[PDB]
Amino acid sequence: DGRYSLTYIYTGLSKHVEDVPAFQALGSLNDLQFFRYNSKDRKSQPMGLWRQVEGMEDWKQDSQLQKAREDIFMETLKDIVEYYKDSTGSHVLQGRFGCEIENNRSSGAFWKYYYDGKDYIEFNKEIPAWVPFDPAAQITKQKWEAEPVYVQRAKAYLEEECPATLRKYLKYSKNILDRQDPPSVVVTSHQAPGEKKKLKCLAYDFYPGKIDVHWTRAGEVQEPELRGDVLHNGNGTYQSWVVVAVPPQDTAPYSCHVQHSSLAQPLVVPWEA
Ligand SMILES: *[C@@H]1O[C@H](CO)[C@@H](O[C@@H]2O[C@H](CO)[C@@H](O)[C@H](O)[C@H]2NC(C)=O)[C@H](O)[C@H]1NC(C)=O
Ligand SMILES: *[C@@H]1O[C@H](CO)[C@@H](O)[C@H](O)[C@H]1NC(C)=O
């Protein structure tokens, strides 16, 4: 088996401006985002290719769960601002938590919070206990540990529940995370009035992201003039391109090359002037 990771991220603002939710949650599996939730709609919604996967999660229930998480998250943020006696300003609390497995074996886990960009508090499941970094975090740790069961639960979440959720999801995500979609390529050239002729090789609809795309001038790999790429999450596909300017009197042969894990061998696509 391979490497898989479930990550969640919470963003809370103490004084949100118009059109920006006070609380936002998102989650991802490896390089793709699978869901989202904010304090405006208050609904957990699947995203990307997960909008078509059925029976992996009850989104109506997860909505109730996020709503609960939100309340606690924002009270935490509120208590910090209270501590610093400065609710006139705009502060943010971002939290990150998730786990990862490799070869069906749990290979790691984390749980950390940031306040106004600085490390606030994090959980060390080995102890098991919360570690405070900011003075206000001393109060927070006190609260999150007022009962013996609390740390036991936090330890249980990273060691059992989370890695469980990740396994459940991989069962319904084989047709998503394990894909090996070969790249379609399209060579095209554009002539800017006054500038050299420019050839653009585009690789698309491929996955995973790792790819090699380069032009060749009579066999000699050229140094791209421009270059870029992207990941369309709604689709779960990547696109990558390269560009080269050609002398106004160059006859040499121009062929694009593409290598990718899903290809039995590299592809080649010459440009017909
Ligand atoms: C996945 O989504 C991407 C982005 O929405 C698709 O790329 C677009 O493809 C159309 C042609 O079908 C172009 O007109 C757009 O310009 C492309 N988007 C841009 C601006 O990059 C892609 O075709 C989709 N792939 C699949 C297989 O669904
Ligand atoms: C790990 O994967 C196996 C199948 O390969 C599955 O039966 C098992 O429940 C998973 N985790 C464990 C060790 O419980």
Side-chain angles (χ1 to χ4, degrees):
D1 293 296
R3 296 264 299 177
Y4 295 97
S5 59
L6 168 60
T7 298
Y8 295 92
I9 297 184
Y10 287 173
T11 294
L13 302 169
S14 75
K15 191 175 283 58
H16 77 91
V17 303
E18 308 292 298
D19 293 311
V20 173
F23 184 79
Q24 278 168 299
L26 63 73
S28 16
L29 287 167
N30 291 10
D31 66 344
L32 306 174
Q33 179 172 159
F34 74 91
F35 106 106
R36 72 174 173 192
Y37 167 106
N38 65 61
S39 64
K40 185 190 173 185
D41 309 319
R42 297 185 115 63
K43 298 307 168 187
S44 297
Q45 317 174 298
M47 290 175 60
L49 301 165
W50 279 281
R51 286 171 295 174
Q52 298 181 298
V53 175
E54 300 171 61
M56 170 197 262
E57 193 59 73
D58 187 302
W59 296 114
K60 292 192 173 57
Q61 195 45 49
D62 194 63
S63 297
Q64 298 315 302
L65 172 57
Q66 295 312 330
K67 291 182 192 173
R69 295 273 184 64
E70 176 194 320
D71 290 326
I72 298 176
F73 192 86
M74 301 306 277
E75 172 176 38
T76 298
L77 170 63
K78 196 186 87 296
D79 300 332
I80 296 178
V81 166
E82 225 86 298
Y83 176 80
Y84 288 101
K85 299 174 183 174
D86 171 37
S87 59
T88 63
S90 186
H91 308 287
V92 52
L93 177 60
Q94 307 173 86
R96 174 167 185 284
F97 61 85
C99 59
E100 51 175 286
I101 65 188
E102 172 168 43
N103 301 176
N104 163 292
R105 296 288 178 173
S106 284
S107 64
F110 52 79
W111 201 334
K112 201 186 182 185
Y113 293 83
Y114 308 75
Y115 176 61
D116 278 348
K118 301 86 182 177
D119 289 357
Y120 185 62
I121 199 178
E122 82 183 2
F123 185 74
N124 186 313
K125 73 185 175 61
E126 196 178 75
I127 299 180
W130 288 92
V131 178
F133 296 126
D134 179 293
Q138 277 163 45
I139 298 311
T140 299
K141 170 179 167 71
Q142 208 73 326
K143 294 195 179 172
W144 295 354
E145 298 176 355
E147 296 302 322
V149 302
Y150 300 157
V151 302
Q152 300 183 312
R153 285 173 188 168
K155 183 185 165 65
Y157 174 76
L158 302 183
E159 297 187 346
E160 309 177 306
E161 296 165 58
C162 206
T165 301
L166 175 69
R167 285 173 207 290
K168 171 178 182 186
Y169 288 178
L170 290 189
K171 276 190 177 182
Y172 297 64
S173 300
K174 285 174 174 291
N175 291 314
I176 296 182
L177 299 176
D178 299 308
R179 285 142 50 221
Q180 276 286 161
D181 301 346
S184 299
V185 321
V186 178
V187 160
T188 188
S189 65
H190 203 302
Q191 182 70 303
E195 301 178 54
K196 310 175 177 298
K197 166 176 292 182
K198 298 180 177 180
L199 313 182
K200 169 186 167 188
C201 186
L202 177 64
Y204 65 114
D205 296 329
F206 67 83
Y207 186 82
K210 176 64 168 301
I211 196 181
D212 187 320
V213 175
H214 68 287
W215 275 103
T216 59
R217 196 248 182 182
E220 293 291 297
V221 49
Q222 298 299 277
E223 179 54 55
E225 166 160 295
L226 196 60
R227 179 193 305 182
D229 65 45
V230 64
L231 160 88
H232 298 290
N233 189 74
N235 217 305
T237 65
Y238 288 81
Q239 281 193 44
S240 180
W241 64 91
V242 173
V243 179
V244 281
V246 51
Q249 191 176 302
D250 194 307
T251 304
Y254 279 130
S255 307
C256 183
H257 301 194
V258 180
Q259 172 60 303
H260 182 287
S261 48
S262 77
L263 299 179
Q265 0 82 304
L267 268 56
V268 176
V269 176
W271 176 65
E272 296 300 299

mmCIF file of all heavy atoms in Angstrom, residues 160-203:
data_model
loop_
_atom_site.group_PDB
_atom_site.id
_atom_site.type_symbol
_atom_site.label_atom_id
_atom_site.label_comp_id
_atom_site.label_asym_id
_atom_site.label_seq_id
_atom_site.Cartn_x
_atom_site.Cartn_y
_atom_site.Cartn_z
ATOM 1 N N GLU A 160 -7.241 6.330 17.189
ATOM 2 C CA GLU A 160 -8.252 5.386 16.752
ATOM 3 C C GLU A 160 -9.289 5.940 15.765
ATOM 4 O O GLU A 160 -9.334 5.533 14.599
ATOM 5 C CB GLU A 160 -8.938 4.803 17.986
ATOM 6 C CG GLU A 160 -7.959 4.268 19.010
ATOM 7 C CD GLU A 160 -8.642 3.761 20.273
ATOM 8 O OE1 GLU A 160 -9.417 4.524 20.896
ATOM 9 O OE2 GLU A 160 -8.397 2.593 20.649
ATOM 10 N N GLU A 161 -10.119 6.867 16.224
ATOM 11 C CA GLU A 161 -11.150 7.437 15.371
ATOM 12 C C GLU A 161 -10.623 8.001 14.062
ATOM 13 O O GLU A 161 -11.050 7.577 12.987
ATOM 14 C CB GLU A 161 -11.912 8.529 16.118
ATOM 15 C CG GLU A 161 -12.683 8.011 17.313
ATOM 16 C CD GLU A 161 -13.131 9.121 18.236
ATOM 17 O OE1 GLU A 161 -13.848 10.034 17.767
ATOM 18 O OE2 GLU A 161 -12.761 9.076 19.429
ATOM 19 N N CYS A 162 -9.695 8.948 14.145
ATOM 20 C CA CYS A 162 -9.175 9.561 12.933
ATOM 21 C C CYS A 162 -8.634 8.521 11.954
ATOM 22 O O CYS A 162 -9.097 8.445 10.809
ATOM 23 C CB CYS A 162 -8.112 10.601 13.268
ATOM 24 S SG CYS A 162 -7.959 11.890 12.015
ATOM 25 N N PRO A 163 -7.653 7.706 12.377
ATOM 26 C CA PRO A 163 -7.146 6.703 11.435
ATOM 27 C C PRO A 163 -8.243 5.744 10.957
ATOM 28 O O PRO A 163 -8.110 5.113 9.912
ATOM 29 C CB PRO A 163 -6.024 6.008 12.219
ATOM 30 C CG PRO A 163 -6.345 6.302 13.648
ATOM 31 C CD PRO A 163 -6.862 7.710 13.617
ATOM 32 N N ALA A 164 -9.336 5.646 11.707
ATOM 33 C CA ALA A 164 -10.439 4.780 11.294
ATOM 34 C C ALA A 164 -11.193 5.472 10.167
ATOM 35 O O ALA A 164 -11.480 4.866 9.130
ATOM 36 C CB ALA A 164 -11.387 4.524 12.458
ATOM 37 N N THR A 165 -11.524 6.742 10.392
ATOM 38 C CA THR A 165 -12.232 7.527 9.406
ATOM 39 C C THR A 165 -11.442 7.482 8.111
ATOM 40 O O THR A 165 -12.016 7.274 7.040
ATOM 41 C CB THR A 165 -12.375 8.992 9.843
ATOM 42 O OG1 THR A 165 -13.073 9.057 11.097
ATOM 43 C CG2 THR A 165 -13.138 9.791 8.784
ATOM 44 N N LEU A 166 -10.128 7.666 8.198
ATOM 45 C CA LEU A 166 -9.304 7.635 6.996
ATOM 46 C C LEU A 166 -9.413 6.300 6.259
ATOM 47 O O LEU A 166 -9.469 6.276 5.032
ATOM 48 C CB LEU A 166 -7.834 7.910 7.321
ATOM 49 C CG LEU A 166 -6.902 7.760 6.109
ATOM 50 C CD1 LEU A 166 -7.139 8.855 5.079
ATOM 51 C CD2 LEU A 166 -5.482 7.810 6.589
ATOM 52 N N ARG A 167 -9.434 5.187 6.993
ATOM 53 C CA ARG A 167 -9.548 3.876 6.349
ATOM 54 C C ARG A 167 -10.894 3.757 5.655
ATOM 55 O O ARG A 167 -10.967 3.354 4.495
ATOM 56 C CB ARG A 167 -9.405 2.745 7.368
ATOM 57 C CG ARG A 167 -7.976 2.487 7.847
ATOM 58 C CD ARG A 167 -8.009 1.461 8.964
ATOM 59 N NE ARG A 167 -6.891 1.576 9.901
ATOM 60 C CZ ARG A 167 -5.637 1.273 9.602
ATOM 61 N NH1 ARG A 167 -5.331 0.838 8.385
ATOM 62 N NH2 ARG A 167 -4.693 1.396 10.523
ATOM 63 N N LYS A 168 -11.962 4.105 6.368
ATOM 64 C CA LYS A 168 -13.300 4.058 5.797
ATOM 65 C C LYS A 168 -13.329 4.810 4.478
ATOM 66 O O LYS A 168 -13.820 4.298 3.483
ATOM 67 C CB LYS A 168 -14.311 4.695 6.748
ATOM 68 C CG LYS A 168 -15.693 4.876 6.131
ATOM 69 C CD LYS A 168 -16.657 5.473 7.131
ATOM 70 C CE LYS A 168 -18.041 5.603 6.548
ATOM 71 N NZ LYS A 168 -18.941 6.309 7.489
ATOM 72 N N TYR A 169 -12.795 6.024 4.485
ATOM 73 C CA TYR A 169 -12.770 6.855 3.295
ATOM 74 C C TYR A 169 -11.981 6.253 2.145
ATOM 75 O O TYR A 169 -12.408 6.316 0.998
ATOM 76 C CB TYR A 169 -12.202 8.243 3.610
ATOM 77 C CG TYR A 169 -13.105 9.150 4.425
ATOM 78 C CD1 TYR A 169 -12.675 10.410 4.809
ATOM 79 C CD2 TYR A 169 -14.373 8.747 4.828
ATOM 80 C CE1 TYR A 169 -13.482 11.251 5.581
ATOM 81 C CE2 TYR A 169 -15.192 9.578 5.599
ATOM 82 C CZ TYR A 169 -14.740 10.831 5.977
ATOM 83 O OH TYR A 169 -15.507 11.660 6.776
ATOM 84 N N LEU A 170 -10.823 5.681 2.425
ATOM 85 C CA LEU A 170 -10.048 5.099 1.341
ATOM 86 C C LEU A 170 -10.840 4.007 0.622
ATOM 87 O O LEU A 170 -10.633 3.765 -0.570
ATOM 88 C CB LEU A 170 -8.736 4.524 1.865
ATOM 89 C CG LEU A 170 -7.669 5.509 2.351
ATOM 90 C CD1 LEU A 170 -6.368 4.758 2.608
ATOM 91 C CD2 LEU A 170 -7.433 6.576 1.301
ATOM 92 N N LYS A 171 -11.747 3.348 1.338
ATOM 93 C CA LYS A 171 -12.552 2.292 0.739
ATOM 94 C C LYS A 171 -13.430 2.841 -0.368
ATOM 95 O O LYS A 171 -13.671 2.168 -1.364
ATOM 96 C CB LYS A 171 -13.441 1.622 1.780
ATOM 97 C CG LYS A 171 -12.771 0.529 2.572
ATOM 98 C CD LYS A 171 -13.798 -0.222 3.400
ATOM 99 C CE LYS A 171 -13.156 -1.373 4.151
ATOM 100 N NZ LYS A 171 -14.156 -2.156 4.927
ATOM 101 N N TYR A 172 -13.913 4.064 -0.179
ATOM 102 C CA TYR A 172 -14.774 4.721 -1.159
ATOM 103 C C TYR A 172 -13.998 5.669 -2.078
ATOM 104 O O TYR A 172 -14.574 6.275 -2.978
ATOM 105 C CB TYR A 172 -15.859 5.530 -0.443
ATOM 106 C CG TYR A 172 -16.820 4.716 0.387
ATOM 107 C CD1 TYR A 172 -16.384 3.998 1.495
ATOM 108 C CD2 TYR A 172 -18.181 4.683 0.076
ATOM 109 C CE1 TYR A 172 -17.280 3.271 2.274
ATOM 110 C CE2 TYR A 172 -19.080 3.957 0.849
ATOM 111 C CZ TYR A 172 -18.623 3.257 1.946
ATOM 112 O OH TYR A 172 -19.511 2.555 2.724
ATOM 113 N N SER A 173 -12.696 5.798 -1.851
ATOM 114 C CA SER A 173 -11.885 6.714 -2.637
ATOM 115 C C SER A 173 -10.870 6.054 -3.552
ATOM 116 O O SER A 173 -10.029 6.733 -4.135
ATOM 117 C CB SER A 173 -11.171 7.696 -1.706
ATOM 118 O OG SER A 173 -12.106 8.442 -0.945
ATOM 119 N N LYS A 174 -10.939 4.735 -3.680
ATOM 120 C CA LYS A 174 -10.015 4.037 -4.558
ATOM 121 C C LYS A 174 -10.096 4.682 -5.936
ATOM 122 O O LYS A 174 -9.077 5.026 -6.534
ATOM 123 C CB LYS A 174 -10.385 2.556 -4.662
ATOM 124 C CG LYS A 174 -10.025 1.723 -3.441
ATOM 125 C CD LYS A 174 -10.568 0.298 -3.578
ATOM 126 C CE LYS A 174 -10.113 -0.620 -2.436
ATOM 127 N NZ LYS A 174 -8.649 -0.939 -2.482
ATOM 128 N N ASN A 175 -11.318 4.860 -6.428
ATOM 129 C CA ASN A 175 -11.529 5.462 -7.741
ATOM 130 C C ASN A 175 -11.228 6.948 -7.768
ATOM 131 O O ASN A 175 -11.634 7.644 -8.697
ATOM 132 C CB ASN A 175 -12.967 5.245 -8.216
ATOM 133 C CG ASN A 175 -13.254 3.803 -8.546
ATOM 134 O OD1 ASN A 175 -12.466 3.148 -9.225
ATOM 135 N ND2 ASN A 175 -14.389 3.297 -8.077
ATOM 136 N N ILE A 176 -10.526 7.437 -6.752
ATOM 137 C CA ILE A 176 -10.187 8.851 -6.704
ATOM 138 C C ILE A 176 -8.731 9.109 -6.375
ATOM 139 O O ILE A 176 -8.044 9.791 -7.125
ATOM 140 C CB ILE A 176 -11.052 9.601 -5.691
ATOM 141 C CG1 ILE A 176 -12.515 9.565 -6.138
ATOM 142 C CG2 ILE A 176 -10.566 11.041 -5.567
ATOM 143 C CD1 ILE A 176 -13.461 10.324 -5.244
ATOM 144 N N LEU A 177 -8.257 8.561 -5.261
ATOM 145 C CA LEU A 177 -6.870 8.763 -4.846
ATOM 146 C C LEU A 177 -5.876 7.851 -5.552
ATOM 147 O O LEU A 177 -4.715 8.207 -5.736
ATOM 148 C CB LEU A 177 -6.741 8.555 -3.336
ATOM 149 C CG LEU A 177 -7.572 9.519 -2.503
ATOM 150 C CD1 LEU A 177 -7.454 9.183 -1.039
ATOM 151 C CD2 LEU A 177 -7.089 10.928 -2.767
ATOM 152 N N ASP A 178 -6.330 6.673 -5.954
ATOM 153 C CA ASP A 178 -5.444 5.725 -6.603
ATOM 154 C C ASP A 178 -5.460 5.792 -8.116
ATOM 155 O O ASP A 178 -4.871 4.951 -8.776
ATOM 156 C CB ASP A 178 -5.779 4.312 -6.130
ATOM 157 C CG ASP A 178 -5.602 4.152 -4.631
ATOM 158 O OD1 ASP A 178 -4.513 4.504 -4.134
ATOM 159 O OD2 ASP A 178 -6.538 3.677 -3.952
ATOM 160 N N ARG A 179 -6.127 6.792 -8.671
ATOM 161 C CA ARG A 179 -6.172 6.932 -10.117
ATOM 162 C C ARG A 179 -4.798 7.100 -10.749
ATOM 163 O O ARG A 179 -3.830 7.499 -10.105
ATOM 164 C CB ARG A 179 -7.022 8.137 -10.510
ATOM 165 C CG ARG A 179 -8.498 7.922 -10.374
ATOM 166 C CD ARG A 179 -9.137 9.178 -9.865
ATOM 167 N NE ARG A 179 -8.718 10.337 -10.636
ATOM 168 C CZ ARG A 179 -8.422 11.512 -10.095
ATOM 169 N NH1 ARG A 179 -8.495 11.679 -8.784
ATOM 170 N NH2 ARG A 179 -8.062 12.523 -10.865
ATOM 171 N N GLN A 180 -4.729 6.789 -12.034
ATOM 172 C CA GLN A 180 -3.513 6.933 -12.802
ATOM 173 C C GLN A 180 -3.955 7.367 -14.182
ATOM 174 O O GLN A 180 -3.660 6.719 -15.172
ATOM 175 C CB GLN A 180 -2.767 5.614 -12.857
ATOM 176 C CG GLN A 180 -1.910 5.408 -11.648
ATOM 177 C CD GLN A 180 -0.677 6.285 -11.681
ATOM 178 O OE1 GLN A 180 -0.042 6.530 -10.656
ATOM 179 N NE2 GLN A 180 -0.318 6.749 -12.873
ATOM 180 N N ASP A 181 -4.691 8.470 -14.224
ATOM 181 C CA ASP A 181 -5.199 9.022 -15.464
ATOM 182 C C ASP A 181 -4.080 9.560 -16.341
ATOM 183 O O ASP A 181 -3.358 10.477 -15.951
ATOM 184 C CB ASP A 181 -6.193 10.137 -15.162
ATOM 185 C CG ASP A 181 -7.363 9.657 -14.335
ATOM 186 O OD1 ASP A 181 -7.538 8.421 -14.224
ATOM 187 O OD2 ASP A 181 -8.107 10.515 -13.808
ATOM 188 N N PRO A 182 -3.924 8.996 -17.548
ATOM 189 C CA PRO A 182 -2.882 9.430 -18.478
ATOM 190 C C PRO A 182 -3.200 10.833 -18.972
ATOM 191 O O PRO A 182 -4.365 11.202 -19.138
ATOM 192 C CB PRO A 182 -2.951 8.379 -19.572
ATOM 193 C CG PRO A 182 -4.414 8.093 -19.627
ATOM 194 C CD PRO A 182 -4.795 7.987 -18.173
ATOM 195 N N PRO A 183 -2.164 11.630 -19.233
ATOM 196 C CA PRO A 183 -2.331 13.007 -19.698
ATOM 197 C C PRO A 183 -2.632 13.154 -21.169
ATOM 198 O O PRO A 183 -2.023 12.487 -21.993
ATOM 199 C CB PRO A 183 -0.985 13.625 -19.367
ATOM 200 C CG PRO A 183 -0.048 12.512 -19.761
ATOM 201 C CD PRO A 183 -0.735 11.267 -19.176
ATOM 202 N N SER A 184 -3.572 14.030 -21.501
ATOM 203 C CA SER A 184 -3.870 14.311 -22.899
ATOM 204 C C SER A 184 -2.947 15.498 -23.164
ATOM 205 O O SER A 184 -2.720 16.303 -22.266
ATOM 206 C CB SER A 184 -5.332 14.736 -23.072
ATOM 207 O OG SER A 184 -6.220 13.711 -22.668
ATOM 208 N N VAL A 185 -2.378 15.611 -24.355
ATOM 209 C CA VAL A 185 -1.514 16.755 -24.613
ATOM 210 C C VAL A 185 -1.980 17.481 -25.855
ATOM 211 O O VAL A 185 -2.571 16.885 -26.746
ATOM 212 C CB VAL A 185 -0.032 16.355 -24.798
ATOM 213 C CG1 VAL A 185 0.334 15.259 -23.810
ATOM 214 C CG2 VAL A 185 0.226 15.937 -26.221
ATOM 215 N N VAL A 186 -1.717 18.778 -25.903
ATOM 216 C CA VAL A 186 -2.113 19.595 -27.036
ATOM 217 C C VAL A 186 -1.028 20.599 -27.312
ATOM 218 O O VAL A 186 -0.728 21.426 -26.461
ATOM 219 C CB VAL A 186 -3.401 20.379 -26.750
ATOM 220 C CG1 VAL A 186 -3.746 21.254 -27.938
ATOM 221 C CG2 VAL A 186 -4.534 19.424 -26.455
ATOM 222 N N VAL A 187 -0.426 20.522 -28.490
ATOM 223 C CA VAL A 187 0.608 21.471 -28.852
ATOM 224 C C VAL A 187 -0.044 22.570 -29.675
ATOM 225 O O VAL A 187 -0.890 22.309 -30.529
ATOM 226 C CB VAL A 187 1.736 20.804 -29.648
ATOM 227 C CG1 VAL A 187 2.517 21.847 -30.414
ATOM 228 C CG2 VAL A 187 2.668 20.085 -28.693
ATOM 229 N N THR A 188 0.339 23.808 -29.399
ATOM 230 C CA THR A 188 -0.228 24.942 -30.104
ATOM 231 C C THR A 188 0.820 26.049 -30.175
ATOM 232 O O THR A 188 1.714 26.116 -29.332
ATOM 233 C CB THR A 188 -1.481 25.453 -29.371
ATOM 234 O OG1 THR A 188 -2.132 26.442 -30.172
ATOM 235 C CG2 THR A 188 -1.093 26.067 -28.025
ATOM 236 N N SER A 189 0.718 26.907 -31.184
ATOM 237 C CA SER A 189 1.677 27.995 -31.341
ATOM 238 C C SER A 189 0.961 29.318 -31.507
ATOM 239 O O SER A 189 -0.109 29.374 -32.107
ATOM 240 C CB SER A 189 2.563 27.751 -32.562
ATOM 241 O OG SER A 189 1.801 27.791 -33.755
ATOM 242 N N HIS A 190 1.546 30.382 -30.965
ATOM 243 C CA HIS A 190 0.950 31.705 -31.084
ATOM 244 C C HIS A 190 2.002 32.737 -31.473
ATOM 245 O O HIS A 190 3.123 32.734 -30.955
ATOM 246 C CB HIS A 190 0.269 32.121 -29.780
ATOM 247 C CG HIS A 190 -0.794 33.154 -29.970
ATOM 248 N ND1 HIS A 190 -0.544 34.380 -30.550
ATOM 249 C CD2 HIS A 190 -2.120 33.131 -29.698
ATOM 250 C CE1 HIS A 190 -1.670 35.065 -30.630
ATOM 251 N NE2 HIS A 190 -2.641 34.330 -30.120
ATOM 252 N N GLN A 191 1.623 33.616 -32.397
ATOM 253 C CA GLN A 191 2.515 34.653 -32.897
ATOM 254 C C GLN A 191 2.059 36.042 -32.479
ATOM 255 O O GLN A 191 1.041 36.544 -32.959
ATOM 256 C CB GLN A 191 2.584 34.586 -34.425
ATOM 257 C CG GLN A 191 3.524 35.598 -35.061
ATOM 258 C CD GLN A 191 4.978 35.292 -34.780
ATOM 259 O OE1 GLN A 191 5.390 35.201 -33.626
ATOM 260 N NE2 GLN A 191 5.764 35.131 -35.837
ATOM 261 N N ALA A 192 2.815 36.660 -31.579
ATOM 262 C CA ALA A 192 2.497 38.001 -31.116
ATOM 263 C C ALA A 192 3.057 38.984 -32.137
ATOM 264 O O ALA A 192 4.239 38.931 -32.476
ATOM 265 C CB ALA A 192 3.122 38.250 -29.747
ATOM 266 N N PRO A 193 2.212 39.892 -32.644
ATOM 267 C CA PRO A 193 2.679 40.869 -33.631
ATOM 268 C C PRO A 193 3.922 41.613 -33.160
ATOM 269 O O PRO A 193 3.842 42.497 -32.308
ATOM 270 C CB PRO A 193 1.473 41.791 -33.800
ATOM 271 C CG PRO A 193 0.784 41.700 -32.469
ATOM 272 C CD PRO A 193 0.853 40.223 -32.184
ATOM 273 N N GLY A 194 5.071 41.238 -33.712
ATOM 274 C CA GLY A 194 6.316 41.880 -33.336
ATOM 275 C C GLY A 194 7.238 40.978 -32.539
ATOM 276 O O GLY A 194 8.440 41.229 -32.450
ATOM 277 N N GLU A 195 6.681 39.924 -31.952
ATOM 278 C CA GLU A 195 7.474 38.988 -31.163
ATOM 279 C C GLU A 195 7.691 37.682 -31.923
ATOM 280 O O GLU A 195 7.019 37.414 -32.920
ATOM 281 C CB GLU A 195 6.773 38.696 -29.837
ATOM 282 C CG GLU A 195 6.534 39.922 -28.979
ATOM 283 C CD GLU A 195 5.805 39.592 -27.693
ATOM 284 O OE1 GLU A 195 6.280 38.703 -26.954
ATOM 285 O OE2 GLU A 195 4.761 40.222 -27.423
ATOM 286 N N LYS A 196 8.631 36.872 -31.447
ATOM 287 C CA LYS A 196 8.923 35.594 -32.079
ATOM 288 C C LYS A 196 7.674 34.713 -32.032
ATOM 289 O O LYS A 196 6.681 35.060 -31.387
ATOM 290 C CB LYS A 196 10.049 34.882 -31.328
ATOM 291 C CG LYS A 196 11.285 35.716 -31.064
ATOM 292 C CD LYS A 196 12.273 34.936 -30.200
ATOM 293 C CE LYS A 196 13.562 35.712 -29.966
ATOM 294 N NZ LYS A 196 14.279 35.989 -31.244
ATOM 295 N N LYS A 197 7.721 33.575 -32.718
ATOM 296 C CA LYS A 197 6.602 32.639 -32.706
ATOM 297 C C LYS A 197 6.739 31.840 -31.418
ATOM 298 O O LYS A 197 7.849 31.467 -31.040
ATOM 299 C CB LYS A 197 6.670 31.698 -33.907
ATOM 300 C CG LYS A 197 5.751 30.490 -33.788
ATOM 301 C CD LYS A 197 5.766 29.633 -35.040
ATOM 302 C CE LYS A 197 5.129 30.361 -36.205
ATOM 303 N NZ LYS A 197 5.098 29.506 -37.416
ATOM 304 N N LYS A 198 5.624 31.576 -30.743
ATOM 305 C CA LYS A 198 5.675 30.832 -29.489
ATOM 306 C C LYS A 198 4.839 29.547 -29.474
ATOM 307 O O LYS A 198 3.639 29.568 -29.753
ATOM 308 C CB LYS A 198 5.276 31.761 -28.337
ATOM 309 C CG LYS A 198 6.225 32.950 -28.183
ATOM 310 C CD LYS A 198 5.828 33.872 -27.042
ATOM 311 C CE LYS A 198 6.834 34.999 -26.877
ATOM 312 N NZ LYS A 198 6.465 35.909 -25.766
ATOM 313 N N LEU A 199 5.501 28.435 -29.144
ATOM 314 C CA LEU A 199 4.884 27.108 -29.090
ATOM 315 C C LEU A 199 4.563 26.712 -27.654
ATOM 316 O O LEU A 199 5.441 26.751 -26.793
ATOM 317 C CB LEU A 199 5.836 26.058 -29.665
ATOM 318 C CG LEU A 199 6.565 26.302 -30.987
ATOM 319 C CD1 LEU A 199 7.394 25.059 -31.310
ATOM 320 C CD2 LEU A 199 5.575 26.612 -32.098
ATOM 321 N N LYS A 200 3.321 26.299 -27.409
ATOM 322 C CA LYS A 200 2.881 25.903 -26.067
ATOM 323 C C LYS A 200 2.371 24.475 -25.962
ATOM 324 O O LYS A 200 1.337 24.135 -26.538
ATOM 325 C CB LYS A 200 1.782 26.844 -25.577
ATOM 326 C CG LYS A 200 1.055 26.393 -24.315
ATOM 327 C CD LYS A 200 -0.092 27.349 -24.048
ATOM 328 C CE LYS A 200 -1.064 26.843 -23.007
ATOM 329 N NZ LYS A 200 -2.250 27.755 -22.959
ATOM 330 N N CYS A 201 3.091 23.657 -25.199
ATOM 331 C CA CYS A 201 2.720 22.260 -24.984
ATOM 332 C C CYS A 201 1.903 22.108 -23.706
ATOM 333 O O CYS A 201 2.395 22.399 -22.618
ATOM 334 C CB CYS A 201 3.957 21.390 -24.855
ATOM 335 S SG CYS A 201 3.506 19.636 -24.771
ATOM 336 N N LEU A 202 0.676 21.622 -23.826
ATOM 337 C CA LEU A 202 -0.181 21.474 -22.662
ATOM 338 C C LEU A 202 -0.553 20.046 -22.316
ATOM 339 O O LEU A 202 -1.119 19.333 -23.136
ATOM 340 C CB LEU A 202 -1.465 22.272 -22.866
ATOM 341 C CG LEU A 202 -2.503 22.151 -21.749
ATOM 342 C CD1 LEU A 202 -1.939 22.739 -20.471
ATOM 343 C CD2 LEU A 202 -3.778 22.866 -22.148
ATOM 344 N N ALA A 203 -0.246 19.632 -21.094
ATOM 345 C CA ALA A 203 -0.603 18.290 -20.640
ATOM 346 C C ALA A 203 -1.860 18.481 -19.789
ATOM 347 O O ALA A 203 -1.905 19.394 -18.969
ATOM 348 C CB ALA A 203 0.528 17.695 -19.802
#
